[PDB]
C-alpha cells in the first residue's frame, strides 16, 4: 500500500458547543470532531484548530487566579488549554486509558471526574501538571448521566442509573480516593438527563421521557406537551437557573422555569413551548440569541422573541448516508436525518451569474465610475494607445480619449481623475472640466500609476512622484529616483497612505516606501528574472499583507507592519499568464487574481486560495450600478458584468426533502435520480414521498423517489409495502434487454429479516417490471457484466435476466456471516461483512459459479469497502479506521481516519486513482495511490513536519494516526492534511523541514490540485 488521504471538506456535524471566556468577552467554543471552533458572541470567529484526536469532552473552569479549557479525545488524551499572534498553550497534558464518554468538572474546581467504563469513575485532581488520575470503583454497572452538585462542602456527583432508574448521590473524597454517602431516590423509568442546579436552589434536575422532577434531600411533573418526543439536550438560560431551555428529538425547543430566613427554595415547574429548531445536539444560550448545534442538519442562530425566530443558517452535511458523483465533476449526497433530510450538490469552485456580455476586444483595463455627486453609474475602459467611456457609450469632459488610461476613478474633494501615459487630469464635477494636469518637467511619459482618493504616485522610468489631491489642485509633495525602472506599484490605505509599495526591474524586488520620503523600510528580493507585474497592499480580517505577482503566475505574499514596513514569512502558482490583482468586497475584502486559472484571494486567519470558474479573466472590477448591483471582466473579446458566488471552496446547493434520504443512483438516459427515502408516520408533515407529481404504491415508510437531475423536482414516488423497508438500488441495463431500470432490494422488517423482494422498475411514471421473493434482507446489489448481483443475508447470488423479463438464479455463494457491501471490478467481487472484514470472489463464466480467491482473516466490522485496483482493497470499519488488503489477504496499510464512512466511490470534483468518501460528520475525504517514491518522501516529510509542528494536546501524530480498535502504527498511508500543513507553517520552520523549501512547495502545490 502506498496510499494518500486528505481532507475536501472539514467535518460540519455539531458534536459539542459551550460559553464561557476564554479568549470580558463571551465566548461560544464548538467541537466537530476534530475541529475546535473558537468565537466571540457580538457570532466574530477567532480562532479555529484541529486537534490530533476526536473530541469527546470539552469544557470550561476557572481555578483560583479567563476560564481554562478541558479537552478529552476518543483516545484518551487529556489536557488544560489556555489562550494567549494567536497561541493555544497547553498548561497540562496526558492519557487517562485504563488496561458514552462523560467529563464533568466539579463547580468549586477540585477535581475532573470521568465516566469512561462500567463500574468506574475516574478523577483527576486539579498541581499535577501530568493530569495523574485515580479510579473508583461505582457498584452501580450501568450510569446514565452524572453531574457535580452546586451547594456543597465535598465535592458530590449526582447520577441516575439503571438495574433489574433510580437517583442516586455520593461525595467524592480525595483524602480516602473512594466514595461516602452523599439523599437518594426509584425514579421515572426513562430518567436519562441530570441537571445541577445552581445557587440558590442547588440540587437536580431530573429529565424522562414524559416526566421533569428537582430534587434537594417531590417536586415532579408530568406535562402532556413532552411525551411527544424525547428531550435529547438542555441549556441554563439564567445563572440563577431560573429558566433552562429544553430540545427534542423533533426540533421542539422548550423553556422550563423554576418559581423561586433567608434561602430560596423550589416553588414550582413550567415547561412552555417555545418553537421549532433544526435537531439539536446541544444548545447554548448567548444572549435572547441561541445556538442550535446539530448533527443531524444544519445548525443556527435563533432569536427568541416576547415564538422563535432563525437568523442564521449553517451548513451541515452530515450524515452522508449515500453519494454519487455526476457531471466536469459534482457530488450529490444523500444527506441528514427524519426532517432535517436533504440532497446536496457539491462542485468545487466559485462561479459567475453572467448579466451581461458584450462584444469588445483588446480591452488592457477597466475602472468603475460614478459621474453623479452614491451608485456607479460608468464604467471607463482602456485599449492600446485609446479610452471608452460606458455609460450605466458616451464621453466624460476633463477625460481624453486618445491615449491610454491607467488609472481613473472618484478623488477627495468631489473630483475625478484621469491618470494616462501623458499627464494626470483632476477633472471638477459640478460641473465637468479639467481644473488641474501635473506633467512630468520634460513631458516624459508616465510608464506605472497608483492612486487611491487622496494620493497619487506614478512612475517616469525610474522616477517616482508623490501627487497630492487637493480642492482644484494636484499638489507635487516629492519625488525620488529608483535605482532599476519601476515594474508596478500601490497605495492602498491601510484613506492617505503612510506607505508605498513597488516592485522593480533587473534586481526583481518588492519594496516598501514612507511617504513623503520614499525612504526604504523594505527590501525583498523575489528571486529570478521576471518581472513583479502587479503589487497589492490589502487587509484580509484585520491583518495586512503585501501580496506580489510575477510575470510567470508565481504569486508572493507577506504579513506587513503598517508602522514598520517589515515584510515577514510564502508563494503560490496561480495560472501561467501574469496576473493582475484588484481588490472587491463581498460583507468581507477579497482579491481578484486574473489569469488563464482566475482565482480570488481571501482569509481561516490564513490567505485561502479559490479557483473562479471561467477560463481566463485579464482585468476586472467591481461594479454597483443600478442595473447591475456586482462585477465587470473582460477577456480577450468580452466585457462581461455579473454577479459572483459566495466566497468559499465548495459550492453546496441543498435539496430539502423534509424525510430521511437513503441511497441515491444516477439514471442518465433519464436524467433524473433514483432515491430510497423514509418518513414517519405516527404522517407528520408534508415531506418529498409526499408532495411528488405523480405516486405509486405497493411508523417508517420507504419510498422510491424520482428526481430530475436539473431542477431537482420530485417527479414521482413509489410506496413500499407495509413493513418492508428498502435497502438497495441499482440503476442498469440486464441482458439483452435495452431498457434501464431502477432495481431496489427490499427487507419485511418484523418487531434479522427472514424476507425481502427485488423489484425492477422503470421510469412520468414507475412501472413495476419484475419481482423476486427472497429469504431476506437485499443488503447490497451492483450490476455485474449484464447480470445482477445481490447480497441477501450471508448469501452474494448473481441472477440473469431472462428474455422473458423475469430473473433467475445461476449461481450463490454462502459462506458469509453477512454479507453487507459489495463493490465489483471486471471478474472480481470485493464482499464486506458485518463482523469478518473482507471476501475476494470471482466468478467463472465457463463453469457458472463463484471462487473465492483470498479473504483478509482479521475480524472487522465493516461500514464500507472499495476496490481501488485490481490487486489493492480498501476497507473502512467502525472504530474509525482505515486499511488496504492485498488465500490470505494481507492487512498492508492501516490508518486511523477519526470519521465514520458510509460510502465510497470513484470520482474527482476536480497520484493514480481518486476514491471519494462520505462520513457521519459530514465529512469529505479522498484517497489516492502513489509510487513508492513519493510514498518514501512524503513519509520523511511527514516525520520532518512532526518534530517541528506544535498539536494543541501535545498529542503526538503517530499515536493519533495509529490503527486503533479493542492499536498499531499507521503503515502504507500518508495523511494528506499534514503534508499540505507545510504551506501554512513559517518560513524558518519550513526551512526546518527541509533540510529546498521552494521545491517541496511545488509538491505539495501539485498534490493540493487533486480536490
Excluded at 488520575?133 to 441516575?160: M, S
Excluded at 450471508?794 to 431472462?802: D, F, I, K, N, Q
Aim: hydrophobic fraction near 40%.
Amino acid at each position: 500500500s502506498y496510499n494518500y488521504v486528505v481532507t475536501a471538506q472539514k467535518p460540519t456535524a455539531v458534536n459539542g458547543c459551550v460559553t464561557g471566556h476564554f479568549t470580558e468577552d463571551l465566548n461560544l467554543l464548538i467541537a466537530k470532531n476534530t475541529r475546535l471552533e473558537i468565537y466571540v458572541v457580538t457570532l466574530r470567529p477567532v480562532k479555529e484548530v484541529g486537534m490530533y484526536g476526536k473530541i469527546a469532552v470539552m469544557e470550561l473552569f476557572r481555578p483560583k487566579g479567563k476560564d481554562l479549557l478541558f479537552i478529552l479525545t476518543a483516545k484518551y488524551n487529556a489536557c488544560i488549554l489556555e489562550y494567549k499572534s494567536i497561541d493555544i498553550i497547553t498548561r497540562a497534558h496526558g492519557n487517562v486509558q485504563d488496561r458514552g464518554i462523560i467529563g464533568i468538572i466539579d463547580p468549586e474546581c477540585r477535581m475532573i471526574g470521568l465516566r469512561l467504563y462500567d463500574g468506574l469513575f475516574k478523577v483527576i485532581p486539579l498541581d499535577n501538571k501530568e493530569l495523574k488520575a485515580f479510579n473508583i470503583r461505582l457498584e452501580e454497572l450501568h450510569v446514565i448521566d452524572v453531574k457535580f452538585l452546586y451547594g456543597c462542602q465535598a465535592p458530590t456527583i449526582c447520577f441516575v442509573y439503571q438495574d433489574p432508574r433510580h437517583v442516586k448521590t455520593y461525595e467524592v473524597s480525595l483524602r480516602e480516593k473512594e466514595f461516602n454517602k452523599g439523599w437518594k431516590q426509584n425514579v421515572e423509568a426513562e430518567a436519562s438527563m441530570v441537571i445541577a442546579v445552581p445557587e440558590p436552589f442547588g440540587g437536580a434536575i431530573i429529565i424522562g421521557q414524559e416526566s421533569i422532577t428537582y430534587h434537594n434531600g417531590y417536586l415532579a411533573i408530568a406535562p402532556p406537551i413532552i411525551k411527544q418526543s424525547t428531550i435529547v439536550c438542555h441549556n441554563r438560560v439564567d445563572p440563577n437557573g431560573s429558566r433552562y431551555l429544553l430540545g427534542d428529538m423533533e426540533g421542539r425547543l422548550f423553556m422550563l422555569l423554576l418559581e423561586k430566613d433567608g434561602t430560596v427554595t423550589l416553588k414550582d415547574l413550567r415547561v412552555e413551548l417555545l418553537g421549532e429548531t433544526s435537531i439539536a445536539e446541544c444548545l447554548t444560550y448567548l444572549d435572547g440569541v441561541v445556538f442550535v448545534g446539530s448533527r443531524l442538519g444544519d445548525s443556527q442562530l435563533v432569536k427568541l422573541n416576547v415564538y422563535v425566530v432563525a437568523m442564521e443558517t449553517f451548513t451541515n452535511l452530515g450524515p452522508i448516508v449515500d453519494m454519487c458523483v455526476v457531471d466536469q465533476g459534482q457530488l450529490v449526497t444523500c444527506s441528514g436525518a427524519f426532517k432535517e433530510g436533504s440532497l446536496r450538490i457539491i462542485r468545487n469552485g466559485i462561479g459567475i451569474h453572467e448579466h451581461a456580455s458584450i462584444d469588445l476586444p483588446g480591452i488592457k483595463g477597466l475602472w468603475p465610475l460614478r459621474s453623479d455627486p452614491e451608485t456607479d453609474d460608468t464604467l471607463v475602459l482602456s485599449f492600446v494607445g485609446q479610452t471608452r467611456v460606458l455609460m450605466l457609450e458616451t464621453e466624460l469632459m476633463g477625460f481624453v480619449d486618445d491615449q491610454q488610461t491607467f488609472f481613473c476613478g472618484n478623488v477627495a474633494h468631489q473630483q475625478l481623475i484621469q491618470i494616462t501615459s501623458a499627464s494626470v487630469r483632476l477633472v471638477s464635477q459640478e460641473p465637468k472640466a479639467l481644473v488641474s494636469e501635473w506633467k512630468e518637467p520634460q513631458a516624459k511619459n508616465i510608464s506605472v500609476a497608483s492612486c487611491n482618493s487622496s494620493q497619487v504616485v506614478v512612475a517616469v522610468g525610474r522616477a517616482l512622484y508623490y501627487l497630492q489631491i487637493h480642492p482644484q489642485e494636484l499638489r507635487q509633495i516629492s519625488h525620488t529616483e529608483m535605482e532599476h525602472e519601476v515594474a508596478c506599484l500601490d497605495i492602498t490605505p491601510l484613506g492617505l497612505s503612510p506607505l508605498c509599495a513597488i516592485g522593480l526591474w533587473t534586481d526583481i524586488s518588492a519594496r516598501i516606501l514612507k511617504l513623503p520620503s520614499f525612504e526604504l523600510l523594505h527590501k525583498e528580493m523575489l528571486g529570478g528574472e521576471i518581472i513583479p507585474r502587479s503589487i497589492l497592499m490589502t487587509t484580509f480580517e484585520s491583518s495586512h499583507y503585501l501580496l506580489c505577482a510575477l510575470g510567470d503566475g508565481a504569486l508572493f505574499y507577506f504579513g506587513l507592519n503598517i508602522e514598520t514596513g517589515l515584510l515577514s514569512d510564502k508563494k503560490v502558482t496561480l495560472g501561467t499568464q501574469p496576473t493582475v490583482l484588484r481588490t472587491f468586497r463581498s460583507s468581507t475584502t477579497n482579491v481578484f487574481a486574473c489569469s488563464d486559472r482566475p482565482t480570488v484571494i481571501y482569509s481561516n486567519h490564513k490567505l485561502v486560495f479559490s479557483n473562479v470558474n471561467l477560463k481566463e479573466v485579464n482585468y476586472m472590477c467591481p461594479l454597483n450600478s443600478d442595473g447591475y448591483p456586482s462585477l465587470a471582466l473582460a477577456n480577450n473579446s468580452t466585457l462581461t458584468i455579473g454577479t459572483i458566488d459566495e466566497i468559499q471552496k465548495l459550492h453546496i446547493r441543498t435539496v430539502p426533502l423534509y424525510e430521511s434520504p437513503r441511497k441515491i443512483c444516477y439514471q442518465e438516459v433519464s436524467q433524473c435520480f433514483g432515491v430510497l427515502s423514509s418518513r414517519i408516520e405516527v404522517a407528520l408533515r408534508p415531506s418529498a414521498s409526499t408532495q411528488a407529481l405523480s405516486s405509486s404504491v405497493s411508523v417508517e415508510v420507504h419510498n422510491l423517489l424520482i428526481i430530475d437531475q436539473h431542477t431537482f423536482e420530485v417527479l414521482h414516488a413509489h410506496q413500499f409495502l407495509q413493513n418492508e423497508y428498502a435497502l438497495s438500488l441499482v440503476s442498469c441495463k440486464l441482458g439483452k434487454d435495452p431498457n434501464t431500470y431502477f432495481i431496489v432490494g427490499t427487507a419485511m422488517v418484523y418487531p434479522e429479516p427472514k424476507q425481502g423482494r427485488i423489484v425492477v422498475f422503470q421510469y412520468g411514471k414507475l412501472q413495476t417490471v419484475a419481482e423476486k421473493e427472497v429469504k431476506g434482507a437485499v443488503y447490497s446489489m451492483v450490476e455485474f457484466n449484464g447480470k445482477l448481483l445481490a447480497s441477501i443475508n450471508s448469501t452474494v447470488r448473481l441472477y440473469e435476466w431472462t428474455t422473458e423479463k423475469e430473473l433467475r438464479t445461476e449461481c450463490n455463494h454462502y459462506n458469509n456471516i453477512m454479507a453487507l457491501y459489495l463493490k465489483t471490478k471486471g471478474d472480481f467481487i470485493l464482499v464486506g461483512d458485518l463482523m469478518r472484514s473482507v471476501l475476494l470472489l470471482a466468478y467463472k463464466p465457463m463453469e457458472g459459479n463463484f471462487e473465492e480467491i483470498a479473504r483478509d482473516f482479521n475480524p472487522n466490522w465493516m461500514s464500507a469497502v472499495e476496490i481501488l485496483d485490481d490487486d489493492n482493497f480498501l476497507g473502512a470499519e467502525n472504530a474509525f479506521n482505515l486499511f488496504v488488503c492485498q488465500q490470505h489477504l494481507q492487512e498492508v496499510g492501516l490508518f486511523h481516519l477519526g470519521e465514520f464512512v458510509n460510502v465510497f466511490c470513484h470520482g474527482s470534483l476536480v497520484t493514480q486513482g481518486s476514491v471519494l468518501f462520505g462520513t457521519v460528520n459530514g465529512m469529505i475525504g479522498l484517497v489516492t495511490s502513489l509510487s513508492e517514491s513519493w510514498y518514501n518522501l512524503l513519509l520523511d516529510m511527514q516525520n520532518r513536519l512532526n518534530k517541528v509542528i506544535k498539536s494543541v494536546g501535545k498529542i503526538e501524530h503517530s499515536f493519533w494516526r495509529s490503527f486503533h480498535t479493542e492499536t498499531e502504527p499507521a503503515t502504507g498511508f500518508i495523511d494528506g492534511d499534514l503534508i499540505e500543513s507545510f504551506l501554512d507553517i513559517s518560513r524558518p520552520k519550513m526551512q526546518e523541514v527541509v533540510a529546498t523549501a521552494d521545491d517541496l512547495i511545488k509538491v505539495v502545490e501539485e498534490l493540493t490540485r487533486i480536490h
